[PDB]
Amino acid sequence: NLAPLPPHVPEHLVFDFDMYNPSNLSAGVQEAWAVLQESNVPDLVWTRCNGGHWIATRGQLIREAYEDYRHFSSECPFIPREAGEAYDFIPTSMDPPEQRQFRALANQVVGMPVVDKLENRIQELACSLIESLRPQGQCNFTEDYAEPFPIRIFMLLAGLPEEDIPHLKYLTDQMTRPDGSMTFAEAKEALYDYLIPIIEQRRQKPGTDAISIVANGQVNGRPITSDEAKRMCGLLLVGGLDTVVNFLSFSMEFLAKSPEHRQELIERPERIPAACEELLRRFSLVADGRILTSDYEFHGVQLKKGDQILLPQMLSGLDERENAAPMHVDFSRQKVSHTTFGHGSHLCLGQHLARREIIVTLKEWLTRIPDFSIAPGAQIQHKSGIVSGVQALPLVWDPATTKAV
Template sequence: MHSTSTIPHPAHVPAARVVDFDIYQPLQPNLDFHASWKALQDSTLPDVVWTPHNGGHWMVLRGRLVSQVLSDYSRFSNRTVLVPKETAGEAYRLLPLSLDPPAHAPFRNLLSKGLSPQAVSKVESAIRTLTIGLIEGFRLKGQCNFTHDFAEQLPIRIFMQIVALPLADMPRLKYLADQFTRPDGSMEFKDVRKNFQAYIAPVIHERRGTDGTDMLSRMINGKVNDRPLTDEEAANLCIQVLVGGLDTVVNFLGFVMLFLARDPVARRTLAAQPTQIGVAINELARRFPLVTVGREVIRDMDYEGVPLKQGEMIVAPTILHGLDETENPAALAVDFKRETVQHSTFGNGSHTCPGAHLARTETRILIEEWLARIPEFAVASGFEITYTGGIVGSVNTLPLTWEVNSTRDLTPIGVTA
């Protein structure tokens, strides 16, 4: 497990703002991942606190402030987004995430096209075919390890297709992406970056100057301010897309299916109204946010009554936006009829996730095809669900069971796992 470096609180940090909270280990006894974060938010703490963990950093606890810190680049820079700043933050200076406007836009444009709704619509039938194939691969067994048998398969295989990388490389890349987002202590952050660079350098060399239509080729051969990308820029762009694409959807699907396994009313509502599933995804995104990133403070300033110093880190957990009662009353309840759904699950401002449409599409298709075939299911009895915190939170393992005779065979001819 990642070991966190704590520091004594600096003189300018008021003692009343100091809280003992580690974003890599946020779990509180007897609470799940989201309830643990919410317990912090619902405590009597002020809206901006400081923790000595992970090199020492500020943290905002309200939805309003989460979206402000993520989007106000005049005060909070994307130069560093991960804590600890000196290790994870330095190693994660990737593109376009580490740039502020206006430098950010030309790099962002290079990757937006490959993840646009038009691009996603081109892989939608592949997503559906693979979804059905995976479900049919275990439906008649009456059980599956959802994490391994589905969540780690669908988004990663589709992503590997979009970037045209061999499936055989999937375990190596997933391991590296995990070391950035939920480090297990087996590799230092700087070595994660080095390993990614060693992997991507020959890919860039091979695809440079070609007219390949996969997402990486298009990015590598794109132009920024009328000039070609340097090898380093191309690598930083590719690594960012790999980290974004390999980890987040996998974990979001885990939270969503855990919820549906435990909530018969929600799954029956969605099964009865499949056309509503697309809209329901937004409420699920609000209720199950999982990313915790931050910003570097640009200059000394007073912010919400605390003195921030230039160069300090301020963390804005997206988890605390969707769960904030002041913006989403009864925030822990999933309510598909909620009038307004406020969240920052896919970020806010110029860095808002370009992969959100792909993530929503994969989640929608999973729920549609799963509920049509396996309408009733539960977490395997006696199994204790555990979670891991970090930059991207996760359900560690999700074993699901169902009665085989309650399932439906809707397999189109020609679909195999």
């Protein structure tokens, strides 16, 4: 359905982009969004899809809106409006100033010093998954490596038992891959039902895991509440799953299809960190947004209080104004500009953990299974949304060209 054009929106700014089903998704999801950057498209447009909303199409405006939390609030960060409204995760549904110290607390459990300590456990996990796949000469990468990898890292961080993985995967999938059978609010309650008792337990008998640290933390000069701890834990769990799963999948699809780029990393593994950054730019995948706190004129366009604006993190690095020949992958790009991990006060806290997951995966995969392809006859299908992704990724290789390391 197209929503009726609100009378403050001029007709020349209307471009009916559907973020959940863009036209020619078949060409690749990044390509499908990049239609918003063709020369006849304004910097700021209105779509009548999904209830109707603004979209900033260029890196400059995306960055500016993410900086201006006074006008562009995270209270309602999702399209459609109803999903944005039910959402109470911390710190993502909060604005500064209140967000600041909640962010600080979350940083204790996923920040840089935690990542340095986790490095080897990440590597051991990646090695075990890859070795289990290696002799088979095939996998669905998305299902067989990408899905099991970040959830296992979360269990380690949060001191949760291995036996809980399938149940927790079921609860998270319900929420982030909705099939229309339940509202966000319903899926959130089912997730909270799992987390609530564990938080109770760890406030009574705290350990040294991430949930204990969060649930017993201090925020704005007082103890965190049980409610706030649950809202934080929900985000700590969800934030590192679909992003990492889908990003690894885009990266491995590209490498399967590009033996010349693959060969570059096989011959020069020291370039893998730079390659990781270039892939983060080219296969950027997140698109959330904000809600107007007041009427506001922004780059010559009148916005009204309560309008939603999609600010696609994906688009900044694809903008030719930010990076020349933006669809071309070059691992030696001198200045790799992107907002893949967002921008402003909510810039991803898990970005350091994410880069280690990516670099460790690429280094270990390329060492053990250097030569692989898309399965004969397969066509890769993408999906579009708040976190865009890969539906399935069938890969094949000759086990004789691999090595058990």
